[PDB]
């Protein structure tokens, strides 16, 4: 009953069928955060958009599904907008369920709203997202 409220269809879908998994080239930065993840970010020639996010690692359903969803929401986005999306995700999952999140901003990201009431699993959800922010800041400076 309530187990489906944390493990929503979208999460289980992304866990079974992950998107943008496997490290790829080119990349402008790479980081490693620990559930573990190695994550790369690629920027466009002009450095204004995220052209690719590639990742590899081991972790639970929530950590792997969050990273999968991350890649779908930020690939093709402008660098300042991608960071805005991360901050919205962070605010939602860290809210203890008081912030449901805006689907215009987060897309499938809002399916992690039910994780918010389980503070232990928030770090599972945030792993890939905090990894991306780091690799994005590094890729931007490298430009």
């Amino acid at each position: 009953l309530r187990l489906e409220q944390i493990y929503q269809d979208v999460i289980l879908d992304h866990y079974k069928h992950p998107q943008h998994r496997g490290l790829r080239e080119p990349f402008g930065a790479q980081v490693y955060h620990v559930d573990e993840v190695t994550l790369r970010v690629a920027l466009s020639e002009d450095g204004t958009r995220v052209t690719d996010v590639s990742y590899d690692g081991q972790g639970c359903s929530i950590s792997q599904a969050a990273t999968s969803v991350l890649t779908e929401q930020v690939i093709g986005q402008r660098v300042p907008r991608a960071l805005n999306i991360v901050d919205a995700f962070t605010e939602m999952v860290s809210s203890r369920g008081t912030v449901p999140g805006d689907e215009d901003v987060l897309g499938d990201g809002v399916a992690f709203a039910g994780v918010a009431k389980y503070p232990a699993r928030v770090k599972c959800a945030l792993l890939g997202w905090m990894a991306f922010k780091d690799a994005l800041a590094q890729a931007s400076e490298a430009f």
Binding site: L3, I6, Y7, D35, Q58, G59, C60, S61, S63, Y118
Partner: protein, 406 residues
């Protein structure tokens, strides 16, 4: 009488967020408290709370009596003399105390360049990192016994030589549940004149412990794992050794003379207790020792090993579940750590928690052990005197439910 035991623990009545009553299988991390312990401490605090070992009013006298009688009750429980126990904040601090004294120039048995410290790959971090730091500070070398495939200390993985000055090891693994061969390790240690340091955090709560009989030089255990309060750990050290050891923490209470220029130090055990002790926690821990003693630790151990056997059988009957540690009950107790093929421990733990079953998931502060078996994390069910056969069955059903859900 299990129903009467359980009635002593208020938390065991709690209904969890999923509507299921608490099945607490994480006593390995921290145990729950009976009314007898809660009440002993509260009665002390509302009646006899005063400074210990000071002069000279009535509350001071009553506090001192409660403190020293508490030390005596705890010493009886673990088969030590009263003067051979030192109180610390936790077992970790007790192991750190030994590791700092062993690098002190004033200690005749201090370690230096050319000396070897031995630990094991089975160890909790508390019995690993202090030895790494001792080696860093002094220039001594760290070596270790490996682990067998069934999660036991591999006595064939290391030969001790005359360089070995310290041998530290667990009495009872907090992951594999193995009971280690203390007498053999002590025998081998003595061939090079090495000191023995026993991590007894998981033995003192779960089985009869006689520290004199074990023949170890030092031992550490923690109160909050044996039904006692937080904020109290215990270091055991042989009387003769404590007498030779310089202090670790310094300040009030542990001095004899003081000038601005220097100080001389009290005898053991007071030498090793700087500042105001955890007075009410000693009272509570002594209450915990009397509570367990009233049940009898042989009976506690038998009950726990019944639960463990059923857990291993139940979990072993599930396809794709593998135990980290022996499936045999030979020289084995709590806990039962396991992996579920195709289901991450965090997910296993979440499904169990939805059923009101509390287990620990992660590396259980034994990352070298997990790495040795190529594992990131395990789920861990640990068992205490207050747990029941039905809770074991709820664990098995929960692990089954996790497979079907994922």
């Amino acid at each position: 009488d299990l129903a009467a035991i359980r009635a002593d623990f208020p938390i065991l009545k709690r209904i969890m967020r999923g509507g299921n009553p608490l099945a607490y299988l994480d006593s390995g991390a921290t145990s729950q408290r009976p009314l007898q312990v809660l009440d002993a401490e509260r009665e002390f605090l509302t009646a006899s709370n005063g400074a210990v070992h000071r002069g000279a009013h009535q509350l001071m006298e009553e506090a001192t009596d409660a403190y020293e009688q508490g030390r005596a009750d705890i010493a009886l429980f673990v088969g030590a003399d009263t003067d051979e126990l030192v109180f610390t904040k936790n077992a970790t601090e007790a192991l750190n105390l030994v590791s700092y004294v062993l690098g002190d120039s004033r200690f005749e048995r201090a370690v230096g360049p050319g000396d070897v410290i031995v630990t094991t790959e089975l160890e909790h971090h508390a019995n690993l990192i202090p030895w790494q730091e001792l080696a860093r500070r002094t220039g001594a070398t760290l070596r270790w016994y490996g682990v067998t495939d069934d999660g036991r200390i591999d006595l064939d993985s290391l030969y001790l030589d005359d360089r070995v000055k310290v041998v530290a090891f667990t009495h009872h693994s907090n992951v594999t549940g193995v009971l280690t061969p203390v007498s053999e390790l002590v025998s081998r240690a003595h061939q090079s004149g090495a000191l023995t340091v026993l991590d007894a955090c998981q033995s003192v709560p779960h089985q009869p412990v006689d520290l004199h009989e074990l023949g170890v030089d030092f031992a550490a255990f923690s109160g909050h794992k044996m039904l006692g309060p937080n904020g109290i750990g215990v270091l055991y050290g042989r009387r003769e050794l404590l007498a030779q050891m310089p202090p670790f923490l310094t300040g009030g209470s542990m001095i004899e003379t003081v000038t601005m220029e220097g100080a001389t130090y009290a005898p053991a055990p007071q030498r090793f207790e700087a500042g105001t002790p955890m007075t009410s926690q000693v009272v509570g821990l002594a209450a915990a020792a009397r509570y367990l003693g009233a049940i009898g630790m042989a009976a506690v151990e038998a009950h726990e090993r019944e639960l463990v056997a059923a857990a291993i059988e139940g979990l072993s009957g599930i396809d794709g579940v593998r135990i980290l540690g022996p499936t045999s009950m030979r020289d084995r107790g709590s806990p039962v750590a396991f992996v579920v093929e195709g289901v991450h421990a965090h997910d296993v733990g979440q499904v169990l928690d939805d059923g009101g079953v509390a287990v620990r998931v992660g590396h259980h502060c034994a990352l070298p052990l997990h790495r040795r078996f190529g594992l990131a994390a395990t789920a861990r069910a640990s068992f205490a005197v207050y747990n029941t056969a039905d809770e074991v069955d709820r664990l098995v059903a929960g692990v089954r439910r996790s497979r079907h859900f994922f």
